[PDB]
Design an enzyme around this catalytic site. Sequence first.
Site, PDB file in Angstrom:
ATOM      1  N   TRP B 130      15.581 -31.586 113.543  1.00 56.44           N
ATOM      2  CA  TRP B 130      15.725 -30.788 114.755  1.00 56.44           C
ATOM      3  C   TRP B 130      14.800 -29.585 114.658  1.00 56.44           C
ATOM      4  O   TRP B 130      14.839 -28.885 113.655  1.00 56.44           O
ATOM      5  CB  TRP B 130      17.174 -30.349 114.868  1.00 56.44           C
ATOM      6  CG  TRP B 130      17.587 -29.619 116.099  1.00 56.44           C
ATOM      7  CD1 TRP B 130      17.340 -29.965 117.399  1.00 56.44           C
ATOM      8  CD2 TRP B 130      18.407 -28.448 116.137  1.00 56.44           C
ATOM      9  NE1 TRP B 130      17.949 -29.057 118.250  1.00 56.44           N
ATOM     10  CE2 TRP B 130      18.605 -28.121 117.494  1.00 56.44           C
ATOM     11  CE3 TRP B 130      18.987 -27.638 115.151  1.00 56.44           C
ATOM     12  CZ2 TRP B 130      19.366 -27.011 117.888  1.00 56.44           C
ATOM     13  CZ3 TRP B 130      19.738 -26.536 115.553  1.00 56.44           C
ATOM     14  CH2 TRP B 130      19.914 -26.238 116.905  1.00 56.44           C
ATOM     15  N   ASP B 211      24.346 -29.792 107.607  1.00 56.24           N
ATOM     16  CA  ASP B 211      24.430 -29.645 109.047  1.00 56.24           C
ATOM     17  C   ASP B 211      25.237 -30.850 109.510  1.00 56.24           C
ATOM     18  O   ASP B 211      24.797 -31.976 109.332  1.00 56.24           O
ATOM     19  CB  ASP B 211      23.030 -29.608 109.668  1.00 56.24           C
ATOM     20  CG  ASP B 211      23.058 -29.455 111.171  1.00 56.24           C
ATOM     21  OD1 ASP B 211      23.955 -30.018 111.828  1.00 56.24           O
ATOM     22  OD2 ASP B 211      22.153 -28.791 111.698  1.00 56.24           O
ATOM     23  N   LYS B 246      28.973 -31.691 120.421  1.00 51.01           N
ATOM     24  CA  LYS B 246      28.751 -33.022 120.801  1.00 51.01           C
ATOM     25  C   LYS B 246      30.027 -33.873 120.745  1.00 51.01           C
ATOM     26  O   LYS B 246      30.314 -34.589 121.668  1.00 51.01           O
ATOM     27  CB  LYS B 246      27.627 -33.585 119.932  1.00 51.01           C
ATOM     28  CG  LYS B 246      26.355 -32.708 120.014  1.00 51.01           C
ATOM     29  CD  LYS B 246      26.030 -31.874 118.675  1.00 51.01           C
ATOM     30  CE  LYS B 246      24.943 -30.781 118.732  1.00 51.01           C
ATOM     31  NZ  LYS B 246      23.567 -31.262 118.767  1.00 51.01           N
TER      32      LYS B 246
END
EC number: 2.6.1.1
Lengths: 396, 396
Positions: B130, B211, B246
């Site tokens: 990302w 993460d 999400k």
Amino acid sequence: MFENITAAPADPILGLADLFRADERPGKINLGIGVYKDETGKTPVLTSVKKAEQYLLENETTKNYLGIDGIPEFGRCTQELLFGKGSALINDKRARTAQTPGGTGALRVAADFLAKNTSVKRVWVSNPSWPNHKSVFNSAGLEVREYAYYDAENHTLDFDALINSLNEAQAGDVVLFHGCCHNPTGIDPTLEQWQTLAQLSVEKGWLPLFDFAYQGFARGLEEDAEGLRAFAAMHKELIVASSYSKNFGLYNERVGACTLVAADSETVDRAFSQMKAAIRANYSNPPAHGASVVATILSNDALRAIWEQELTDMRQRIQRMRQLFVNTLQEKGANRDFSFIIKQNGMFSFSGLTKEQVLRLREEFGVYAVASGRVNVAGMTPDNMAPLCEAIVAVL
Amino acid sequence: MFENITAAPADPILGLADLFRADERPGKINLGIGVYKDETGKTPVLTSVKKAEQYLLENETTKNYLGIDGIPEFGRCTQELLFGKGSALINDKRARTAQTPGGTGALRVAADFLAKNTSVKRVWVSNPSWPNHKSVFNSAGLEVREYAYYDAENHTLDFDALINSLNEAQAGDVVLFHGCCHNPTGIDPTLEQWQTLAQLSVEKGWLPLFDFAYQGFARGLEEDAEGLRAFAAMHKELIVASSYSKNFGLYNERVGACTLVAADSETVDRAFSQMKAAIRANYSNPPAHGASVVATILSNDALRAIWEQELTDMRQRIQRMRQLFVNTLQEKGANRDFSFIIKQNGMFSFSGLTKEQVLRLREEFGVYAVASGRVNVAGMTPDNMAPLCEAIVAVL
Ligand SMILES: *[C@H](C[C@@H](N)CCC(=O)O)c1c(COP(=O)(O)O)cnc(C)c1O
Ligand SMILES: *[C@H](C[C@@H](N)CCC(=O)O)c1c(COP(=O)(O)O)cnc(C)c1O
């Protein structure tokens, strides 16, 4: 990696609150609180906010990310509150607003933006100020210097000392001003003092940073922005970090704004692109719920009217407690002048008591103020005022 | 002060979205999206979330500030998701969790904590990752170095290259791992690969930073945490930056967590005091609404069951689109192997197309992928799959 980390200094907020909870005495009184409380000792959700939250529950169809700068309507409503509807700053598109997680988030976004994109190395903060100001600016790598503010003898603004202090500020330094309801003193510049400071700032090349967390708690929404607007009329550039935590009672939803002002639209847009980069690399984009409540209220005639009256109710209860405090101290035999409490604006004042008197109030009477002196007058009620004042007279 | 500021690089997200909006062709298709979409092309509020929001509207009586680390129940539920109910890490009180404004906020809090309180100077990030990872760590003053990850030839994990890359990492460097559903490749280590990496990390003295933004989107809640738990079993210390954006569809409410793990309770509490200081100087305390929704759901049997099924529905629709994509490409005459798409996990994959093919897809066919290659398979539907695949075959 973590075995040798030095603990942070003990949290004095946590903290004082823990000591108060553990205190088995009544009537213990907590004036060390950091929020508004009503006459029942509660911090309710505002009715305007509940109505807005119901509307959002009924009408929201997605939680898709906001833009980096947040809800556009929130930005527009924020600039009108700051500068006034029909302001040249707005007409000339000289201001850009990012919705942020609280006033604190706006201060940190401002600090990160300045540290990374300008020559700024130093921020001037009043003595005293909210203690987190130094922490925020230092976190971004900026030095904090103090300027004189509080006259401990007269309980007023030491304006000559302020001006003398700030003579040491160099062109290109940032100077932090509280828009209204100075925290912790409640002592604000008069309009003429604001105008003097605005002219001086231009002459000396300071970048003004306004912390505007209490709009509406001194005299009213428009009156409380007079100082900021005097600066805005005189400066090409400034930054405003504003908060809706207190005047919407939205503390835990983290609702604030960082407003960047430059000489023209091209310049502010270019500069704002880097402010958005500083946000992206921090928390990406801002929390919708609280700001959506604020935008929903401010942009609707009916909800805005209810909210403005709720804010007026808070402002007036605070002023009533300031008056009742002074009257009751006199009636309980304090026999000294506390009239400065009536002149001061907002939730917070210094009582003029020493750190040892504050400690004695806690230990012997169960009356809690911040150790360094801040009292929250919204912790006062008609019901607790007499014992509060009896305790204070006893330590004089 | 602002007249000479260099503009930030053009926002490629904003951006691609702007180009797509302006495109007057149908059937234009946007696979460059950064969120889940259902079969109707919407990103609804989850039903479990709406039910929780109604409960909060009915029962909240204050917006008083949360603690710096947020809602305690949110923290407890987070640690159970990460480590498993009955984990030794939890029993031994080796972990502390701060509620943060999104996964991004957790990454930045982790970065600021490390920069200010440890000797860490460098974070190793996969190539690719990302793009905001580098921005976040750089913002805290940390260098970012890349390690090999993606095998562009075989569309798999280049495990030998990964290990070779990370040999250059020094003891005391941080290494970033995606817990599951690697972004942008969807390529995850096998459990045995995770175990190999865990052992290597201990031997080389790396601090693992996980993460964990997609728990539940690969195989399931517990399965998706296998990798993290293999590391946790082997390390005294690690950090997890997790996100509920999400898997709860709560993107704009900014709901995440930074979990700090140390060898014992005394050490993690001491270290966490400085993590709280880093939060205080950033956004003060975290936004309640989104996290309260998550805590309300996770701690209630009925709401949790509805939410787990909604997450399963998302996971399964994503896998169905991966399968349908591969089948339809074959049927439209692609005549090359895309089976890697079925093996990859989560919303995102590289298609194996070049940057010029991606540009051609946009310009000639109105099919939008991220320029550097990321496609979001949740932008695919049964209705748009045939034209999508016809366009792709046409640029092969
Ligand atoms: C608010 C003062 C509060 N925060 C007292 C409690 C505490 O210190 O935690 C305040 C802010 C912060 O506003 P946000 O909560 O919206 O971030 C900023 N500036 C001033 C002058 C304040 O009084
Ligand atoms: C989420 C990827 C999103 N953010 C894609 C859109 C965009 O880039 O803006 C993601 C995060 C961030 O999660 P939060 O929104 O909760 O902060 C962190 N890490 C990874 C690997 C992600 O995919």
